[PDB]
């Protein structure tokens, strides 16, 4: 029984089990995950002081607050109607981090949000990777799998197994009703953007440059790029643009939260 000071078991583990706590996919939840999302950014406030900063532990625990600060604004963006896409776009990209996320919770909504808004070929993906991926739990292993969807984007293929089904089975089922008859059929392959990547993915697989992530939608930075003080930290002007008029013309406190946050973090608005 060793000592942990800087209390990286109890940070991860909270991490953990609040990305696979129910109920977490609506815009009631976002103090949950602005909290998470505080108690990370105030962990690495202190590592970089007590200059364990960049070991791994330093640098996993900034992609687990990052993955908090995506999760947070995205409840923010389903407090509005008018976010509604930027909340969406926040599920798409939270699949490049499920090797930290149950990944069946993950695809599941991803492929819900995609639905919702209307963007149905991704939907039809990742809701079948969805269906996939509570087999293969029940299975219990990952064996079963084709990763043929997701062959050139940032969606890691090696995740771990949830030794538990994270969706209740109404909600598997409703969502197997609508991918078989939907499957009668649509065109079935990921978007693409002009870089001829996936357009969630921050590598382009054809040039071989990491995008940025924008700190609104996690979408790769491809053109009006701005840039913040902390190093690394970017979002694209129009995402900005649209959170602030959500901002302006609703007054949303959670939304105003994530904007002092954004400030706080990455050291003054842009
Ligand atoms: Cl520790």
């Given amino acids: 029984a060793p000592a942990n000071p800087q209390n990286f078991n109890i940070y991860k583990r909270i991490f953990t089990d609040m990305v696979s706590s129910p109920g977490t996919n609506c815009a009631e939840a ?58 969406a776009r926040l599920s798409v990209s939270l699949l490049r981090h499920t090797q930290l996320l149950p990944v069946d919770k993950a695809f599941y909504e991803a492929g819900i949000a995609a639905k919702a808004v209307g963007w149905d070929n991704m939907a039809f993906i990742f809701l079948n990777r969805f269906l996939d991926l509570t087999d293969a739990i029940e299975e219990g292993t990952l064996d079963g799998l084709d990763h043929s969807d997701f062959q050139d984007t940032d969606i890691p293929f090696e995740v771990p197994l949830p030794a538990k089904q994270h969706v209740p089975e109404a909600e598997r089922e409703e969502v197997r ?4 008859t939907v499957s009668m059929d ?12 996936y357009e969630a993915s921050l590598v382009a697989a054809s040039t071989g440059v990491r995008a940025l992530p924008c700190l609104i939608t996690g979408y790769p930075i491809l053109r009006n790029k701005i ?12 995402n900005w643009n649209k959170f602030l008029m959500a901002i302006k013309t609703s007054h949303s406190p959670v939304c105003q939260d994530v904007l002092k946050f954004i400030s706080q973090w990455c050291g003054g608005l842009p």
């Fill in 30 to 87: 976002y103090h949950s995950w602005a909290d998470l999302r505080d108690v990370l950014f105030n962990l690495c406030e202190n590592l970089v002081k007590s200059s364990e900063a960049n070991s791994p532990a330093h640098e996993e625990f900034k992609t687990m607050l990052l993955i908090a600060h995506y999760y947070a604004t995205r409840s923010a963006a389903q407090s509005v109607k008018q976010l509604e896409t930027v909340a």
């Fill in 177 to 180: 009703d609508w991918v078989l």
């Fill in 186 to 197: 649509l065109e079935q392959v990921l978007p693409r953007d002009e870089r001829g990547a």
């Fill in 227 to 238: 840039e913040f003080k902390r190093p690394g930290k970017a979002a694209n002007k129009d």
